[PDB]
């Protein structure tokens, strides 16, 4: 038996994603400046921080 | 769950001229009930149509689905109507008589 008359959470069993995963990178170009070379982009972090 | 500019009345242009009313009706009843239909007649309005649906959801999912439909070598350009002005007075006499009917019938006062 399944109890009836309880309110509806409009959610599924499909996999959903913890909102802290997303959105931690942004842009729509490559990281290569269009093939420009004389820029300093070897690393992806600041040295000490 | 609707955005208020949704209407049960939408404005359509890019129709074939002289387009068959029956087609109009079933083309648009690919969604549900059509309360009314008006086609423009003066050449300026020739080729466009106001369509009045009887259901909010019918009208809206029509505006969702058909907008971007191509029949007769042209895409059907649609929009919601902004029924933002009245065009003649609301006829006090019959209004109060039908509400007098309401009250006489259902015994409110």
């Amino acid at each position: 038996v399944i109890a009836l008359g309880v309110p509806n959470p409009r959610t599924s069993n499909e996999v959903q994603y913890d909102q802290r995963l997303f959105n931690q990178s942004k842009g729509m170009d490559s990281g290569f400046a269009g093939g420009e070379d004389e820029i300093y982009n070897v690393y992806d972090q600041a040295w000490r921080g | 769950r609707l955005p208020p500019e949704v209407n049960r009345i939408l404005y359509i242009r890019n129709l074939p001229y002289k387009i068959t009313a029956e087609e109009m009706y079933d083309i648009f009843g690919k969604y549900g009930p059509i309360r009314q239909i008006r086609v423009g007649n003066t050449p300026e309005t020739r080729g466009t149509a106001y369509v009045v649906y009887e259901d909010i959801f019918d009208a809206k999912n029509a505006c969702d689905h058909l907008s971007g439909f191509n029949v007769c070598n042209r895409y059907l350009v649609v929009l919601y109507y902004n029924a933002n002005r009245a065009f003649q007075k609301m006829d006090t006499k019959k209004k109060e008589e039908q509400l007098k009917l309401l009250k006489e019938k259902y015994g409110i006062n």
């Binding site: 996999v15 802290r20 995963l21 997303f22 931690q24 729509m28 290569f32 000490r48 | -």
Partner: protein
């Protein structure tokens, strides 16, 4: 398998069952989760397009073969800086060679 586990559990995958594989995979699995994943689901033919840019721009691109949002970031060279400093002698062995003591800054950790 992890998505199938998340469905069997009804729960959501957190950052924790994906911090292991966050920079692996060779579309770089952390590209599923960027900000413009939606608009970039509409970019097709980007490899041919970057190849043919040689006929439009007067520079010659060393990275014609790749894109940072579509492939991911495929190398990480951050240990090179650390090991280069320790191999050249440490920051002190390095700053013995410089005008650092002529500057009169008390310590070397703030300079910029």
């Amino acid at each position: 398998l992890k998505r199938q586990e998340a469905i069997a559990q009804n729960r959501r995958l957190t950052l924790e069952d994906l911090e292991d594989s966050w920079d692996r995979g060779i579309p770089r699995i952390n590209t599923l989760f960027q900000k413009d994943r939606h608009t970039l689901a509409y970019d097709k033919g980007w490899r041919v397009r970057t190849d043919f840019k040689q006929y439009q721009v007067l520079k010659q691109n060393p990275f014609w073969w790749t894109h940072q949002r579509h492939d991911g970031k495929l190398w990480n060279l951050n240990n090179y800086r650390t090991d280069m400093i320790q191999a050249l002698g440490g920051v002190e062995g390095i700053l013995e060679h410089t005008l650092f003591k002529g500057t009169y800054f008390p310590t070397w950790e703030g300079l910029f």
